[PDB]
A paper describes a structure:
Two high-molecular-weight exotoxins, [name] ([name]) and toxin B (TcdB), secreted by [name] are the major virulence factors responsible for CDI, which lead to a wide spectrum of clinical symptoms ranging from mild diarrhea to life threatening pseudomembranous colitis. The sequences and three dimensional structures of [name] and TcdB show a similar modular arrangement which could be divided into four functional domains: an amino-terminal glucosyltransferase domain (GTD), a cysteine protease domain (CPD), a delivery and receptor-binding domain (DRBD), and a carboxy-terminal combined repetitive oligopeptides domain (CROPs). Acidification in the endosomes then triggers a hydrophobic pore-forming region in the DRBD to undergo conformational rearrangements in order to deliver the GTD and the CPD across endosome membrane into the cytosol, where the CPD cleaves the GTD upon binding inositol hexakisphosphate (InsP6). Here we reported the co-crystal structures of [name] AH3 and [name] in complex with [name] GTD (residues 1-542) and a fragment of [name] DRBD (residues 1073-1464, termed as TcdA1073-1464), respectively.
We examined [name] binding to a series of recombinant [name] fragments using a pull-down assay, and we found that a fragment of [name] DRBD (residues 1073-1464, termed as TcdA1073-1464) was sufficient for [name] binding and most suitable for crystallization. The overall structure of the [name]-bound TcdA1073-1464 is similar to that of the standalone [name] fragment in the context of the holotoxin with a RMSD of ~0.576 Å over 313 residues, indicating that [name] does not force appreciable conformational changes in the toxin. Residues from all three CDRs of [name] contribute to direct interactions with TcdA1073-1464 with the CDR3 playing a dominating role. The structure reveals that [name] recognizes two regions in TcdA1073-1464 that are well separated on the primary sequence but converge on the 3D: residues I1105-N1111 (region 1) and T1305-N1387 (region 2). Of note, the region 1 is a part of the pore-forming region of [name], which includes residues 958 to 1130 in the holotoxin. [name] binding stabilizes the conformation of this part of the pore-forming region via mostly van del Waals interactions involving [name] residues D61, S62, R66, and E88 in the FR3 and [name] residues I1105, P1106, L1108, N1110, and N1111. The region 2 of [name] mediates most of the [name] binding via extensive interactions with all three CDRs. It is worth noting that N1387 of TcdA1073-1464 is likely a key epitope for [name] as it points toward a pocket in [name] that consists of residues R99, V100, I101, S102, S104 and A105 in the CDR3, forming three pairs of hydrogen bonds and two van del Waals interactions. We found that [name] significantly inhibited the unfolding of TcdA1073-1464 at pH below 4.3, which is consistent with the effect of 5D on TcdB, suggesting that [name] may block the pore formation of [name].
Residue numbers in the entry:
A (entry chain D): 1 to 121
B (entry chain A): 1080 to 1087, 1094 to 1463
The structure:
């Protein structure tokens, strides 16, 4: 019954910006903290940021400034604003319900299929 | 005993003093200005002026921010240091020094194809006969590293003199011909950039038979945090560990009479960063709905605690603790071998029995089985 579907990825040129979104249904969105993850081949899943029910955030400081998580509870939507993209940012970006940071927690998460983001030269 | 469990802080996140690195062109830059770099070495020099651990608020031992401590031995009152190196220089010609300003006819060149230089060798940090009287300590936050670095044209730096430039000179003087951080070669040059390449670092904590309380640092850089692990050697004392919501790999070598307590209040609660410190919020829905218990491994949310040593002991219980209200504590009694847990609520009898309904709702909100519950009134 839980649905999570990401949108907004695509082929982007180095230095561009992109806003990802994830629509949610099947649960009370505002009751949950929510996470953005990205995953490239050859790496473990990478935790980007988690947004609390009060709009405060917890984030990796290597994504600092360039990636910004936000939520719109009335639209049941999670957002990830991305800025100054670079080829190393190429991955499948996906949303997960809850606060999932460790590899096992991410791989066991309630998550969407992801939206592919490709930055290349 | 459960009283001691219930008896088990505005400390900053890692990097508030040493700096938090940034990802620039796909590599971590710790500092990117000459004066900022010098200031990092000035910060490091505090390990000599104050020792490897500081004592904050006369209650807790706190290692120097970004000091690579690879072992803490509570039996021998000693520390081991890990690797903190910086790339060496080769070549150059016509070196002189005038007024402590190095000069070259041809400048030397930084190379990652020759052995790197130990920064800590130039500090001479005291690692022995340390005072471990305080029974609360924040764990070290610093993986081993080799600092790659760069020079650039930087004028007007010839009068800079502080404990950082002294340490940089000490490196230069200890490895003659292999390190120059400020020099003239037709133009004034200096180190402009510090680029750590971190290395997997296991931090061994050799416990004694005593009550030892540990705070895990909050490391907000994934690439640093993922290079670190803690390995505790139990000696039959009473041990507590306050886990960070930013998880770090942890192994516990269980001894027969160890009492282990893991404070999970950060893991079960909303966390944000304000003024360089942790801010706790409300409980996270279903954060404990899939506790994974095995003889050699416990998974609690984003926490993974591995267990070695006496892992086939059928009689041992370990305890997880957190606060449900400002007056009620939740203790999760775990038997790793039985792969089982039960719950204990602890607080004032009047308050607890009053708010019993509210409290069992919180337990169920956390995702826990509420079928086995004991009650401890104060």
């Amino acid at each position: 019954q839980v649905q999570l579907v990401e949108s907004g990825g695509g082929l982007v040129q180095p230095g561009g910006s992109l806003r990802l979104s994830c629509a949610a249904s099947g649960f009370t969105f505002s009751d949950y903290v929510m996470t953005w993850v990205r995953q490239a081949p050859g790496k473990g899943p990478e935790w980007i940021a988690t947004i609390n029910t009060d709009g405060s955030t917890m984030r990796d400081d290597s994504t600092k400034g360039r990636f910004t998580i936000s939520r719109d509870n009335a639209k049941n939507t999670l957002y990830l604003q991305m800025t100054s993209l670079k080829p190393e940012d190429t991955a499948l970006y996906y949303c997960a319900r809850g606060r999932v940071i460790s590899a096992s927690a991410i791989r066991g998460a309630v998550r969407g299929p992801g939206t592919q983001v490709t930055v290349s030269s | 005993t459960v009283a001691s469990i219930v008896g088990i802080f505005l400390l900053p996140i890692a990097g508030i003093s040493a700096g938090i690195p940034s990802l620039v062109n796909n590599e971590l830059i710790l500092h990117d200005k000459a004066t900022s770099v010098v200031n990092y070495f000035n910060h490091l020099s505090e390990s000599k002026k104050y020792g490897p651990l500081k004592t904050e608020d006369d209650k807790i031992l706190v290692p120097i921010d970004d000091l690579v401590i690879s072992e803490i031995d509570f039996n021998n009152n000693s520390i081991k240091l890990g690797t903190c190196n910086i790339l060496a220089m080769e070549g150059g010609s016509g070196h002189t020094v005038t007024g402590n300003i190095d000069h070259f006819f041809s400048s030397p060149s930084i190379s990652s194809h020759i052995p790197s230089l130990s920064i800590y060798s130039a500090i001479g940090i005291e690692t022995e006969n340390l005072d471990f009287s305080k029974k609360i300590m924040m764990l070290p936050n610093a993986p081993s590293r080799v600092f790659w670095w760069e020079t650039g044209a930087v004028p007007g730096l010839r009068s800079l003199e502080n404990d950082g430039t002294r340490l940089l000179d000490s490196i230069r003087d200890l490895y003659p011909g292999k390190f120059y951080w400020r020099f003239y070669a037709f133009f004034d040059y200096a180190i402009t950039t510090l680029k750590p390449v971190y290395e997997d670092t296991n931090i061994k904590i050799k416990l004694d038979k005593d009550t030892r309380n540990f705070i895990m640092p909050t490391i907000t850089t994934n690439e640093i945090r993922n290079k670190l692990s803690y390995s505790f050697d139990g000696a039959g004392g009473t041990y507590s560990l306050l886990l960070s919501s930013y998880p770090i790999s942890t192994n516990i070598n269980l001894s027969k009479d160890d009492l282990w307590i893991f404070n999970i209040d950060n893991e079960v609660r909303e966390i944000s960063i304000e003024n360089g410190t942790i801010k706790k919020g409300k409980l996270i829905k279903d954060v404990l709905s899939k506790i994974d218990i095995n003889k050699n491994k416990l998974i609690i949310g984003n926490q993974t605690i591995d267990f070695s040593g006496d892992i086939d002991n059928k009689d041992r219980y370990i305890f997880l603790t957190c606060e449900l209200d400002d007056k009620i504590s939740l203790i999760i009694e775990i038997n790793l071998v039985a792969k089982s847990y039960s719950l204990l609520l602890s607080g004032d009898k009047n308050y607890l029995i009053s708010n019993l309904s509210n409290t069992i709702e919180k337990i169920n909100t956390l995702g826990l089985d509420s079928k086995n519950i004991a009650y401890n009134y104060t």
